[PDB]
Amino acid sequence: GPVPSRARVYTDVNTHRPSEYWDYESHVVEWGNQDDYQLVRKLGRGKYSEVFEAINITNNEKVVVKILKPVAAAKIKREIKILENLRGGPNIITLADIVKDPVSRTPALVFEHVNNKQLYQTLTDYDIRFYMYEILKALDYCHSMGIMHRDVKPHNVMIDHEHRKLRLIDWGLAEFYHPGQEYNVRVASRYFKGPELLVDYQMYDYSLDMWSLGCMLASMIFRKEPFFHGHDNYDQLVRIAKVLGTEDLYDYIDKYNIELDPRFNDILGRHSRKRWERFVHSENQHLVSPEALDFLDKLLRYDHQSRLTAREAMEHPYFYTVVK
Numbered sequence: 001g002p003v004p005s006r007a008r009v010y011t012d013v014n015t016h017r018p019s020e021y022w023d024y025e026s027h028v029v030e031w032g033n034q035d036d037y038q039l040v041r042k043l044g045r046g047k048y049s050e051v052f053e054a055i056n057i058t059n060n061e062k063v064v065v066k067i068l069k070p071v072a073a074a075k076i077k078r079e080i081k082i083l084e085n086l087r088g089g090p091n092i093i094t095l096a097d098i099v100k101d102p103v104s105r106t107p108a109l110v111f112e113h114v115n116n117k118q119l120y121q122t123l124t125d126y127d128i129r130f131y132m133y134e135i136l137k138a139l140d141y142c143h144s145m146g147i148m149h150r151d152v153k154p155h156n157v158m159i160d161h162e163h164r165k166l167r168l169i170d171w172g173l174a175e176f177y178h179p180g181q182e183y184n185v186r187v188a189s190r191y192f193k194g195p196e197l198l199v200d201y202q203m204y205d206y207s208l209d210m211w212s213l214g215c216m217l218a219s220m221i222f223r224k225e226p227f228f229h230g231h232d233n234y235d236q237l238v239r240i241a242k243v244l245g246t247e248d249l250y251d252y253i254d255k256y257n258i259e260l261d262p263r264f265n266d267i268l269g270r271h272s273r274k275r276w277e278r279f280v281h282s283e284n285q286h287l288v289s290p291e292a293l294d295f296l297d298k299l300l301r302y303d304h305q306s307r308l309t310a311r312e313a314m315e316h317p318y319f320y321t322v323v324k
């Protein structure tokens with residue numbers, strides 16, 4: 001069968017934990033009071049939830065309320081456990097309350113207010129490096145705590161540009177990393193899906209978030225939204241193969257003894273690996289540097305084991321110019 005894989009960092013953090021840390025189903029929810037809050041307006045609608053601006057009418061504090069649709073509601077114990085385990089961490093959203101509506105019979109997660117994808121195509125070279133470092137602080141933190149985010153994308157990064165503050169949000173797909181565990185490949189949003197997901201390789205790890213991060217980086221420095229514009233999950237892999245090449249793609253599936261879905265035979269073809277300088281033009285050359293290209297190259301690798309971890313990414317010369 002497929003060759004097994006392990007994370008090369010934080011491999012055994014959850015195995016040393018008392019079961020309460022990762023055994024989220026065992027967690028008993030302490031429901032707060034929904035009457036403490038008044039919903040002001042809907043901020044967005046997704047397949048998993050609806051997000052609203054709200055006020056805690058007791059203290060007059062602004063909050064963000066995420067009302068969960070049935071698919072997300074069924075996994076609420078996992079998301080709560082992850083949010084509580086990570087609360088206080090660098091650039092992680094703060095879960096403030098857990099409430100249940102007796103009217104609709106649905107649960108909601110209440111978060112401390114965060115000010116705010118329209119911004120990330122507008123940043124200077126310095127601000128891309130600065131904001132990328134802030135995202136890396138959150139990814140190193142959750143990875144070090146044995147958690148994979150699995151949905152890194154611009155919409156899950158809330159930027160308060162006036163105060164140069166950033167939060168990694170929507171931990172709804174986040175999961176505890178257990179070495180040797182086979183995970184569901186139906187995670188992350190299409191343009192940010194790692195090759196491992198697209199080839200149905202289930203024994204993935206934290207490195208998945210590093211591919212997603214590279215997609216965000218490629219989009220920012222090249223001003224190409226999204227960077228890998230797949231029509232569907234099959235065309236998503238073809239778009240990646242037109243950039244990274246088919247030769248390294250086949251070496252990847254060979255290393256892990258994976259077989260592509262035969263439908264790739266009439267759509268994949270053969271593609272040379274392109275050099276990153278190929279995506280440089282007059283409108284984006286001020287955002288590109290040899291350090292940016294070297295860094296990007298080291299994130300966007302087929303082999304999930306060969307990608308920089310969050311910590312190695314923070315050591316990259318691309319971040320030497322960022323005040324620490």
Ligand SMILES: NCc1cc(Cl)cc(-c2cccc3[nH]ccc23)c1
Nearest residue numbers: 034035037065067101104106107108
């Ligand atoms: N006091 C009104 C209020 C405050 C908050 Cl924080 C939430 C809700 C709500 C409305 C509709 C569906 C829901 N599911 C879970 C909560 C919820 C109502």
